[PDB]
Amino acid sequence: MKIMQVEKTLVSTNRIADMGHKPLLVVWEKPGAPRQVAVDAIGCIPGDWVLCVGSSAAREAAGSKSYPSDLTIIGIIDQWNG
Amino acid sequence: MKIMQVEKTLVSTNRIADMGHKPLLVVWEKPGAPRQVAVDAIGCIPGDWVLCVGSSAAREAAGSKSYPSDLTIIGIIDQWNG
Amino acid sequence: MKIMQVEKTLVSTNRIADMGHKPLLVVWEKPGAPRQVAVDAIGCIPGDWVLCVGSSAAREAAGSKSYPSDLTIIGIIDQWNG
Amino acid sequence: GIALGMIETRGLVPAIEAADAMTKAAEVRLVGRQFVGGGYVTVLVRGETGAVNAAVRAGADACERVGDGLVAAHIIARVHSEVENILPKAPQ
Amino acid sequence: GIALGMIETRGLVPAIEAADAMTKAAEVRLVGRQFVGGGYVTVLVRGETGAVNAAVRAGADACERVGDGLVAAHIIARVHSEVENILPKAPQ
Amino acid sequence: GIALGMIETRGLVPAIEAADAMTKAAEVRLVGRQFVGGGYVTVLVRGETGAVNAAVRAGADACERVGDGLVAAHIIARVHSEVENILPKAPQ
Amino acid sequence: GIALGMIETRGLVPAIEAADAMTKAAEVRLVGRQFVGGGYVTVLVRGETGAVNAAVRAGADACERVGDGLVAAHIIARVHSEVENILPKAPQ
Amino acid sequence: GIALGMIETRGLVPAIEAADAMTKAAEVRLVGRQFVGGGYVTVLVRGETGAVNAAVRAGADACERVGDGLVAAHIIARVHSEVENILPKAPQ
Amino acid sequence: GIALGMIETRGLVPAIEAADAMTKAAEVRLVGRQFVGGGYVTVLVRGETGAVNAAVRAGADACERVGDGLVAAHIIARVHSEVENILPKAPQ
Amino acid sequence: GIALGMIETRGLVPAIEAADAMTKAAEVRLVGRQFVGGGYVTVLVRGETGAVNAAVRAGADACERVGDGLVAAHIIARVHSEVENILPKAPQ
Amino acid sequence: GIALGMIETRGLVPAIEAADAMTKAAEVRLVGRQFVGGGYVTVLVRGETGAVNAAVRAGADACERVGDGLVAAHIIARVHSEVENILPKAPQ
Amino acid sequence: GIALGMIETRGLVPAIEAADAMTKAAEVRLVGRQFVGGGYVTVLVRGETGAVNAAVRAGADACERVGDGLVAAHIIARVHSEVENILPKAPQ
Amino acid sequence: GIALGMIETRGLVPAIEAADAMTKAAEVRLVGRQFVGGGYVTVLVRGETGAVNAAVRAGADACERVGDGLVAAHIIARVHSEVENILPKAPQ
Amino acid sequence: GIALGMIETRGLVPAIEAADAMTKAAEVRLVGRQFVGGGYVTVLVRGETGAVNAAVRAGADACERVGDGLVAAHIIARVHSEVENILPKAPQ
Amino acid sequence: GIALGMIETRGLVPAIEAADAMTKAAEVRLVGRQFVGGGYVTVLVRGETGAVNAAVRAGADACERVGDGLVAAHIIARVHSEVENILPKAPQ
């Protein structure tokens, strides 16, 4: 997993049907780091340092063995400062 | 696999249930390096140089073919100094 | 696959049981490059230039579709100049 | 931390495995190991509630197989002032 | 308080849970925890009669599902002076 | 902290029991009791995530059989600012 | 006394009967009547634990066949300071 | 007097009950509570023969259903001088 | 005297009965009472051989129905000198 | 050497056997024997991981058929500083 | 002679019989009796290997039918130095 | 103490027995013994409600088979102030 | 370099494969290849315990299918000095 | 001493295991390893009678499960002087 | 040695066969050949316990069919010091 800060929400109206009603968030490890998008499975607010699982594991985490996620947020780290 | 040093523990109380009761550790390849988080399946102390498996395997090592892990510690190297 | 050079052997006694009786070798892209550990399915001497495989593939090459591996040496390049 | 985590096992091998696991999982301090009598050994940790939770869950999963097992794994987030008098302050 | 409430449990974890529950439930003071051997831990509280009734009922409900269990829940409303010598004064 | 712990019960007696349980279980501050309509009463507690988790579990268990019981127990670990505007800050 | 006894009824007639019964049966002080919504009215009494127990039982037995009935009867022997904030101080 | 009444119980709650009962029933002095091991707790009273009989019978009646119960209730009217050295003088 | 008589009973009550009986029956000195663990209490007397035989028999008969009973009654007429080190010389 | 190998047995004969086997098999230091209660005896050895693993395997095989047997054989390759306070530093 | 023979029994009387038997039977020195807990007592002898074998066989036979009996009989011909630190040197 | 426990018996002997049992069981004060006429004797205790309930239970059990028996055993947790005047205040 | 790992195979091809695997798997010196006669060939390696364990496990897996097979694969962590005489120092 | 213990194994790995075992078990000196041919390896140890018995039994037990196995385990307690010419003096 | 091995035969031929066999089998010394009368001849050997066991077995097996026969074969590993006086020191 990787520790990332949630930056902002991502909205794609014309996403694939398989994405479901799932929230997507823009997460970067460091402000200024390359941004990535993670399905938010927990309900994470901006500024949160969160735990992000990657390949294959992410799909089940976001809801199915077949969900199209390569990045999901599995948890919010309780105490973290970069 | 990768050789990395456990730096500290990581508590996310709001993690997904699928993660189980398994412990999570903050691991870096070196000090001052990108930090990654790993499910610990061995029982590793801080300062340990440990072996971390990649993604499909991580899930299985972490405990199931359908476990949410992309990095699991699979062994502690007996002697390594990085 | 990525060509890496076998540098040394890795011994972990407290590895997971599924890791098996298999050998483990520290490999690098070039000397001084980040060190990674790969299961050896070939039988490689130190200093050999080898071909290592990635995540889903590594598991099977090591011997079970469910094996705990993300890097596995699947061959020794007969003539590689470094 | 003011949260108590306690694990009871039948035998001490299970208890050590659990303490180790607990201490490893979260930032929790082992404040006691008690031989109850009868073969029940309770190992007790203190820390913040999330830390205690992580620790107890990890430790329980670890020790269930070892030996004769786990009798109980419990977390108490707020420990009453009165109950602290019956609780170990340091491991001996 | 001259009433005494006592809970006996199989193991220490259930007993700490009982002490906590009781002390939280009503105004009872924990006066002792005793290891009887064979796995029995008895946790004892002193309070006014009603408080003790409430507390014991609370401890019993709580400790029942924690650990091996509960063996006894008892209240002695007025305890004789001779018995005091056997009963533990303050938790240690 | 920021976590929101919420238990909705069918009726007020169940909820007072839940609230008591939550506050006695962990370090949570009860920020509101709301009569929704229909006989649904929601009691809301705020705190750090560990505390909120412990509290909600305890409360839910406690109020389940009290009266008409529990409708919902939910933990929201980090609450969005916008949702904070609809959340009671102190009881009234 | 600081114990809390609460009876929830469907309808106000059952509740007034309960309050009356409780107050007559034991030494309790009525501190509130609340309209929850949906036809639930909760009557709350404070007193010593034993008194409160007696009162709630009496009240339940009285209100049970009056009107639509008794939904709940509950005693809390010590109520947390946070819960006190949501509890009516005197009847109104 | 010199009579000895002994009640042995499985667990301490039954023994304390027995002791209280015995002391209240007759003029006897509690001289010891001993943890034998394996959960057996023996509570011993000295006094005159009639008093001792009354005490033990009361004690037994009292502790038989409390906890895990009564293992033994026994009266020895005069005990040998030698057996005195193994019998407790005052409770500790 | 040289001979050793030992009676083991489950619990202290049967054992005290046995000690009393032995010491009363013949000229034997109670030299130990030992709490073995797990409920086994062993009472040991040393005397001349016929005396020890008589004492053990008496004691065994006495305690068989007191409490949980007699595990074992044994007589050793001369104990090897090495065995004397593990044998108590005065009742503690 | 910071690995820990622990073997629990029912009784001391099995444990002495395990200890001897473990020590002979590999370079481990016996750091303790603990009588847990209930007949459980844990024998703990320290050393490097390979040594501890070898030792523990050897030990378990040795004590399995001795007495009441092996309850648990366990190896922990690295032990937390916290768990070190609950582990013996020397055999005595 | 440095071999070790150990016999473990359930209860002390079987062990004293074993020790007497062993010492009488062959050239062994009683080095200790250990109360394990749970009712187990271990009696240990040292001597030459064969003498220890004879002794242990005899001991097993003597205590097999005494009390609750033998649990274990074992001989270790050479005991590792580390093990010697957990074994009683002289009888107490 | 507000509560009242009254036990009515046929004869003074059953009543003294009841009174004794009551006063011993829980902390209540005999406020009266009344010779009603006809042979009915009423013994009345005043205490806090839990106490009075315990006491009356003890008393009824105690006097049921003593002499002629128990006519009644009744508890009033709070009596109307007017009834107080018809109620005895110190025992006759 | 204390530990010894030995693999015996039927035929020399399986043994060369095994030695090769061992030496590749870990840092263990190959101290010998022995022709026992009958076709048993033993390959022996010397390294630290973990190294030897790794090597041997690897070698065994490698030679299981090579030729007529693996007869034995054994690891001895601490080898008694006496055995070192019968063990080959270097390969030739 | 002069007694000879001899173990024959199919293969050398079982033989090295036996030698190690024997030598660790008792005070015996490995005087030889012989490759008979056909795959038989005999490992021979010399020591006093009891040591040799202990050792041979230990060696047998150990090597039985290692490799192809044990063919013979034998003790010659007094070995004739003519036979010494055929027995190996020191190991090779 | 302290062990006594003794064989009794009817007649001297069986006894010389036995002695020879014993002395040849193990390192035992022949301390007596006694003519009991009636044709009983007893051949007595002394040595270390194991040696003596081996010797006596060889002896008894040897003399079974030689002449009239074996009456007895017996081993006493340590004899009381008093029995040493009636025992022969060197053969006549």
CSV table of N, CA, C and O in Angstrom, one decimal, chain I residues 6-89:
chain,number,residue,atom,x,y,z
I,6,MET,N,1.7,-41.1,54.9
I,6,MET,CA,1.3,-39.9,54.2
I,6,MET,C,-0.1,-40.2,53.7
I,6,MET,O,-0.4,-41.3,53.3
I,7,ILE,N,-1.0,-39.2,53.9
I,7,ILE,CA,-2.4,-39.3,53.3
I,7,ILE,C,-2.6,-38.1,52.4
I,7,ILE,O,-2.3,-37.0,52.8
I,8,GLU,N,-3.0,-38.3,51.2
I,8,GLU,CA,-3.3,-37.3,50.3
I,8,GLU,C,-4.8,-37.3,50.1
I,8,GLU,O,-5.4,-38.4,49.9
I,9,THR,N,-5.4,-36.2,50.1
I,9,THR,CA,-6.8,-36.1,50.0
I,9,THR,C,-7.0,-35.0,49.1
I,9,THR,O,-6.1,-34.3,48.7
I,10,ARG,N,-8.2,-34.8,48.5
I,10,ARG,CA,-8.5,-33.7,47.7
I,10,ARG,C,-9.1,-32.5,48.5
I,10,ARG,O,-10.3,-32.6,48.9
I,11,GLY,N,-8.4,-31.5,48.7
I,11,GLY,CA,-8.9,-30.4,49.6
I,11,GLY,C,-8.4,-30.5,51.0
I,11,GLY,O,-8.1,-31.5,51.5
I,12,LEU,N,-8.4,-29.4,51.7
I,12,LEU,CA,-7.9,-29.3,53.1
I,12,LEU,C,-8.9,-29.9,54.1
I,12,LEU,O,-8.4,-30.4,55.0
I,13,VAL,N,-10.2,-29.8,53.9
I,13,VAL,CA,-11.0,-30.4,54.9
I,13,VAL,C,-10.8,-31.9,55.1
I,13,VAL,O,-10.6,-32.4,56.3
I,14,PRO,N,-10.8,-32.7,54.0
I,14,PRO,CA,-10.6,-34.1,54.3
I,14,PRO,C,-9.2,-34.3,54.9
I,14,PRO,O,-9.1,-35.2,55.8
I,15,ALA,N,-8.2,-33.6,54.6
I,15,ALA,CA,-6.9,-33.7,55.2
I,15,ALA,C,-6.8,-33.4,56.6
I,15,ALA,O,-6.2,-34.1,57.3
I,16,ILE,N,-7.5,-32.3,57.0
I,16,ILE,CA,-7.5,-32.1,58.5
I,16,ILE,C,-8.2,-33.2,59.2
I,16,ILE,O,-7.8,-33.6,60.2
I,17,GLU,N,-9.3,-33.7,58.6
I,17,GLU,CA,-9.9,-34.8,59.3
I,17,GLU,C,-8.9,-35.9,59.4
I,17,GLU,O,-8.8,-36.4,60.5
I,18,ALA,N,-8.2,-36.2,58.4
I,18,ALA,CA,-7.3,-37.3,58.4
I,18,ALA,C,-6.1,-37.0,59.4
I,18,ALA,O,-5.8,-37.9,60.1
I,19,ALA,N,-5.6,-35.8,59.5
I,19,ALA,CA,-4.5,-35.5,60.5
I,19,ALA,C,-5.0,-35.7,61.8
I,19,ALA,O,-4.4,-36.4,62.6
I,20,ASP,N,-6.2,-35.3,62.1
I,20,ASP,CA,-6.8,-35.4,63.4
I,20,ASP,C,-6.9,-36.8,63.8
I,20,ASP,O,-6.3,-37.3,64.8
I,21,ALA,N,-7.4,-37.6,62.9
I,21,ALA,CA,-7.6,-39.0,63.1
I,21,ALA,C,-6.3,-39.7,63.4
I,21,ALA,O,-6.2,-40.3,64.4
I,22,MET,N,-5.3,-39.4,62.6
I,22,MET,CA,-4.0,-40.1,62.7
I,22,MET,C,-3.4,-39.8,64.0
I,22,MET,O,-3.0,-40.6,64.8
I,23,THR,N,-3.3,-38.5,64.3
I,23,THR,CA,-2.6,-38.1,65.5
I,23,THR,C,-3.3,-38.6,66.7
I,23,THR,O,-2.7,-38.9,67.7
I,24,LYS,N,-4.6,-38.7,66.7
I,24,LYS,CA,-5.4,-39.3,67.8
I,24,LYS,C,-5.2,-40.7,68.0
I,24,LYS,O,-5.1,-41.2,69.1
I,25,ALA,N,-5.2,-41.5,66.9
I,25,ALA,CA,-5.0,-42.9,67.0
I,25,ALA,C,-3.7,-43.4,67.5
I,25,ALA,O,-3.8,-44.3,68.3
I,26,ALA,N,-2.6,-42.9,67.1
I,26,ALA,CA,-1.4,-43.5,67.5
I,26,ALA,C,-0.4,-42.4,67.7
I,26,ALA,O,-0.7,-41.3,67.4
I,27,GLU,N,0.8,-42.7,68.3
I,27,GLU,CA,1.7,-41.7,68.6
I,27,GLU,C,2.5,-41.4,67.4
I,27,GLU,O,3.6,-41.8,67.2
I,28,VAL,N,2.0,-40.5,66.6
I,28,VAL,CA,2.6,-40.1,65.4
I,28,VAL,C,2.7,-38.6,65.4
I,28,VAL,O,1.8,-38.0,66.0
I,29,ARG,N,3.7,-38.0,64.9
I,29,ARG,CA,3.8,-36.5,64.9
I,29,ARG,C,3.5,-36.0,63.5
I,29,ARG,O,4.0,-36.5,62.6
I,30,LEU,N,2.6,-35.0,63.4
I,30,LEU,CA,2.3,-34.4,62.1
I,30,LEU,C,3.5,-33.6,61.8
I,30,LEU,O,3.9,-32.7,62.5
I,31,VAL,N,4.1,-33.9,60.6
I,31,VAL,CA,5.4,-33.3,60.3
I,31,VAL,C,5.2,-32.4,59.1
I,31,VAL,O,6.0,-31.6,58.8
I,32,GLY,N,4.1,-32.6,58.4
I,32,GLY,CA,3.8,-31.8,57.3
I,32,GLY,C,2.5,-31.8,56.8
I,32,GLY,O,1.8,-32.7,57.0
I,33,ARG,N,2.1,-30.7,56.1
I,33,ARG,CA,0.8,-30.7,55.5
I,33,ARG,C,1.3,-29.9,54.3
I,33,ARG,O,1.9,-28.9,54.4
I,34,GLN,N,1.0,-30.4,53.1
I,34,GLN,CA,1.5,-29.8,51.9
I,34,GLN,C,0.5,-29.6,51.0
I,34,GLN,O,-0.3,-30.4,50.8
I,35,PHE,N,0.4,-28.4,50.4
I,35,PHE,CA,-0.5,-28.1,49.4
I,35,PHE,C,0.3,-28.4,48.1
I,35,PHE,O,1.2,-27.7,47.7
I,36,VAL,N,0.0,-29.5,47.5
I,36,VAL,CA,0.6,-30.0,46.2
I,36,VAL,C,0.3,-29.1,45.0
I,36,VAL,O,1.2,-28.8,44.2
I,37,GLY,N,-0.9,-28.7,44.9
I,37,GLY,CA,-1.3,-28.0,43.7
I,37,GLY,C,-2.6,-28.7,43.3
I,37,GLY,O,-2.8,-29.8,43.7
I,38,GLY,N,-3.4,-28.1,42.5
I,38,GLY,CA,-4.5,-28.8,41.9
I,38,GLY,C,-5.5,-29.5,42.9
I,38,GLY,O,-6.1,-30.4,42.5
I,39,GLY,N,-5.5,-29.0,44.1
I,39,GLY,CA,-6.4,-29.6,45.1
I,39,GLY,C,-5.9,-30.7,45.9
I,39,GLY,O,-6.6,-31.2,46.7
I,40,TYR,N,-4.7,-31.1,45.7
I,40,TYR,CA,-4.1,-32.2,46.4
I,40,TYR,C,-3.5,-31.7,47.7
I,40,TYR,O,-2.6,-30.8,47.6
I,41,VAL,N,-3.9,-32.1,48.8
I,41,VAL,CA,-3.3,-31.8,50.0
I,41,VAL,C,-2.8,-33.0,50.6
I,41,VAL,O,-3.5,-34.0,50.7
I,42,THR,N,-1.5,-33.0,51.1
I,42,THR,CA,-0.9,-34.2,51.6
I,42,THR,C,-0.5,-34.0,53.0
I,42,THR,O,0.2,-33.1,53.3
I,43,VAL,N,-1.0,-34.8,53.9
I,43,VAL,CA,-0.7,-34.7,55.3
I,43,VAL,C,0.3,-35.8,55.7
I,43,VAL,O,0.0,-37.0,55.4
I,44,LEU,N,1.4,-35.6,56.3
I,44,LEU,CA,2.4,-36.5,56.6
I,44,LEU,C,2.8,-36.7,58.1
I,44,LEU,O,3.0,-35.7,58.7
I,45,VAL,N,2.8,-37.9,58.6
I,45,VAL,CA,3.1,-38.1,60.0
I,45,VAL,C,4.3,-39.0,60.1
I,45,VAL,O,4.5,-39.9,59.3
I,46,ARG,N,5.2,-38.8,61.1
I,46,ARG,CA,6.3,-39.7,61.3
I,46,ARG,C,6.2,-40.3,62.7
I,46,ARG,O,6.0,-39.6,63.7
I,47,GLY,N,6.3,-41.6,62.8
I,47,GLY,CA,6.3,-42.3,64.1
I,47,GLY,C,6.9,-43.7,64.0
I,47,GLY,O,7.5,-44.0,63.1
I,48,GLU,N,6.8,-44.4,65.1
I,48,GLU,CA,7.3,-45.8,65.1
I,48,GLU,C,6.4,-46.6,64.1
I,48,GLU,O,5.3,-46.2,63.9
I,49,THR,N,6.9,-47.7,63.6
I,49,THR,CA,6.1,-48.4,62.6
I,49,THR,C,4.7,-48.9,62.9
I,49,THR,O,3.8,-48.6,62.1
I,50,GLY,N,4.4,-49.5,64.0
I,50,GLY,CA,3.1,-49.9,64.3
I,50,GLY,C,2.2,-48.8,64.4
I,50,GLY,O,1.1,-48.7,63.9
I,51,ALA,N,2.7,-47.7,65.0
I,51,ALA,CA,2.0,-46.5,65.2
I,51,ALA,C,1.6,-45.9,64.0
I,51,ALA,O,0.5,-45.5,63.8
I,52,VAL,N,2.6,-45.8,63.0
I,52,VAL,CA,2.3,-45.2,61.7
I,52,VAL,C,1.3,-46.0,61.0
I,52,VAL,O,0.3,-45.5,60.5
I,53,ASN,N,1.3,-47.3,61.1
I,53,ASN,CA,0.3,-48.2,60.4
I,53,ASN,C,-1.0,-47.9,61.0
I,53,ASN,O,-2.0,-47.5,60.2
I,54,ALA,N,-1.2,-47.8,62.3
I,54,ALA,CA,-2.4,-47.5,62.9
I,54,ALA,C,-3.0,-46.1,62.5
I,54,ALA,O,-4.1,-46.0,62.1
I,55,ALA,N,-2.1,-45.1,62.6
I,55,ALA,CA,-2.5,-43.8,62.2
I,55,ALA,C,-2.9,-43.7,60.8
I,55,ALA,O,-4.0,-43.2,60.5
I,56,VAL,N,-2.2,-44.4,59.8
I,56,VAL,CA,-2.6,-44.2,58.5
I,56,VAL,C,-4.0,-44.8,58.3
I,56,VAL,O,-4.9,-44.3,57.7
I,57,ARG,N,-4.2,-46.0,58.9
I,57,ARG,CA,-5.4,-46.6,58.7
I,57,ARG,C,-6.6,-45.8,59.2
I,57,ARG,O,-7.5,-45.5,58.5
I,58,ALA,N,-6.4,-45.2,60.4
I,58,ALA,CA,-7.4,-44.4,61.0
I,58,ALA,C,-7.7,-43.2,60.1
I,58,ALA,O,-8.9,-43.0,59.9
I,59,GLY,N,-6.7,-42.6,59.7
I,59,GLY,CA,-6.9,-41.4,58.9
I,59,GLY,C,-7.5,-41.6,57.6
I,59,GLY,O,-8.4,-40.8,57.2
I,60,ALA,N,-7.2,-42.7,57.0
I,60,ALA,CA,-7.8,-43.0,55.7
I,60,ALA,C,-9.3,-43.3,55.9
I,60,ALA,O,-10.0,-42.9,55.0
I,61,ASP,N,-9.6,-44.0,56.9
I,61,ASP,CA,-11.0,-44.3,57.1
I,61,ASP,C,-11.8,-43.1,57.5
I,61,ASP,O,-12.9,-43.0,57.1
I,62,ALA,N,-11.2,-42.2,58.2
I,62,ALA,CA,-11.8,-40.9,58.5
I,62,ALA,C,-12.2,-40.0,57.4
I,62,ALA,O,-13.3,-39.5,57.3
I,63,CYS,N,-11.3,-39.9,56.5
I,63,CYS,CA,-11.4,-38.9,55.4
I,63,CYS,C,-12.0,-39.3,54.2
I,63,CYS,O,-12.2,-38.6,53.3
I,64,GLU,N,-12.4,-40.6,54.0
I,64,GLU,CA,-12.8,-41.1,52.8
I,64,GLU,C,-14.1,-40.4,52.4
I,64,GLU,O,-14.3,-40.2,51.2
I,65,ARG,N,-15.0,-40.2,53.3
I,65,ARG,CA,-16.2,-39.5,53.0
I,65,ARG,C,-16.3,-38.0,53.3
I,65,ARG,O,-17.3,-37.4,53.1
I,66,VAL,N,-15.2,-37.4,53.9
I,66,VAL,CA,-15.2,-36.0,54.2
I,66,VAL,C,-14.8,-35.4,52.9
I,66,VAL,O,-13.8,-35.8,52.4
I,67,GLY,N,-15.5,-34.4,52.5
I,67,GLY,CA,-15.2,-33.7,51.3
I,67,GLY,C,-15.2,-34.4,50.0
I,67,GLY,O,-16.1,-35.1,49.7
I,68,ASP,N,-14.1,-34.2,49.3
I,68,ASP,CA,-14.0,-34.9,48.0
I,68,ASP,C,-13.2,-36.1,48.2
I,68,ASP,O,-13.1,-36.8,47.2
I,69,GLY,N,-12.7,-36.4,49.4
I,69,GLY,CA,-12.0,-37.7,49.6
I,69,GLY,C,-10.6,-37.9,49.7
I,69,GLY,O,-9.8,-37.0,49.8
I,70,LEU,N,-10.2,-39.2,49.7
I,70,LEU,CA,-8.8,-39.6,49.9
I,70,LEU,C,-8.3,-40.1,48.6
I,70,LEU,O,-8.8,-41.0,48.0
I,71,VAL,N,-7.2,-39.4,48.1
I,71,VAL,CA,-6.5,-40.0,46.9
I,71,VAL,C,-5.7,-41.1,47.3
I,71,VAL,O,-5.7,-42.2,46.7
I,72,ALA,N,-4.9,-41.0,48.4
I,72,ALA,CA,-4.0,-42.1,48.7
I,72,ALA,C,-3.5,-42.1,50.2
I,72,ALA,O,-3.2,-41.1,50.7
I,73,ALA,N,-3.3,-43.3,50.7
I,73,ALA,CA,-2.8,-43.4,52.0
I,73,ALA,C,-1.6,-44.3,51.9
I,73,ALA,O,-1.8,-45.4,51.3
I,74,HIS,N,-0.5,-44.0,52.4
I,74,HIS,CA,0.7,-44.8,52.2
I,74,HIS,C,1.7,-44.8,53.4
I,74,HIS,O,1.9,-43.8,54.0
I,75,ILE,N,2.2,-46.0,53.7
I,75,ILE,CA,3.2,-46.1,54.8
I,75,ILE,C,4.5,-46.5,54.3
I,75,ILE,O,4.6,-47.4,53.5
I,76,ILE,N,5.6,-45.9,54.8
I,76,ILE,CA,7.0,-46.3,54.5
I,76,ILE,C,7.7,-46.5,55.7
I,76,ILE,O,8.0,-45.5,56.4
I,77,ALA,N,8.0,-47.7,56.1
I,77,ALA,CA,8.6,-48.0,57.4
I,77,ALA,C,10.0,-47.4,57.6
I,77,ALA,O,10.3,-47.1,58.7
I,78,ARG,N,10.9,-47.4,56.7
I,78,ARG,CA,12.2,-46.7,56.8
I,78,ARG,C,12.2,-46.1,55.5
I,78,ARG,O,11.9,-46.8,54.5
I,79,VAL,N,12.6,-44.9,55.4
I,79,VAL,CA,12.7,-44.2,54.1
I,79,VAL,C,14.2,-44.0,54.0
I,79,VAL,O,14.9,-43.9,55.0
I,80,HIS,N,14.7,-44.1,52.8
I,80,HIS,CA,16.1,-44.1,52.5
I,80,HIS,C,16.5,-42.8,52.9
I,80,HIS,O,15.8,-41.8,52.9
I,81,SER,N,17.8,-42.6,53.3
I,81,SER,CA,18.3,-41.4,53.8
I,81,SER,C,18.2,-40.3,52.8
I,81,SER,O,18.1,-39.1,53.2
I,82,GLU,N,18.3,-40.5,51.5
I,82,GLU,CA,18.2,-39.5,50.5
I,82,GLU,C,16.8,-38.9,50.5
I,82,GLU,O,16.6,-37.7,50.2
I,83,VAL,N,15.8,-39.7,50.7
I,83,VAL,CA,14.4,-39.3,50.7
I,83,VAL,C,14.1,-38.4,51.8
I,83,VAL,O,13.2,-37.6,51.8
I,84,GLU,N,14.8,-38.4,52.9
I,84,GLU,CA,14.6,-37.6,54.0
I,84,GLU,C,14.8,-36.1,53.8
I,84,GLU,O,14.3,-35.3,54.5
I,85,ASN,N,15.5,-35.7,52.8
I,85,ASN,CA,15.7,-34.3,52.4
I,85,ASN,C,14.4,-33.7,51.8
I,85,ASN,O,14.2,-32.5,52.1
I,86,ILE,N,13.7,-34.4,51.1
I,86,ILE,CA,12.4,-33.9,50.5
I,86,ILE,C,11.3,-34.1,51.5
I,86,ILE,O,10.2,-33.7,51.1
I,87,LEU,N,11.5,-34.6,52.7
I,87,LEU,CA,10.4,-34.8,53.6
I,87,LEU,C,10.4,-33.7,54.7
I,87,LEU,O,11.5,-33.3,55.2
I,88,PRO,N,9.3,-33.2,55.0
I,88,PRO,CA,9.2,-32.1,56.0
I,88,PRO,C,9.5,-32.5,57.4
I,88,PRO,O,9.2,-33.6,57.8
I,89,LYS,N,10.1,-31.6,58.2
I,89,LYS,CA,10.5,-32.0,59.5
I,89,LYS,C,9.6,-31.3,60.5
I,89,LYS,O,9.5,-31.8,61.7
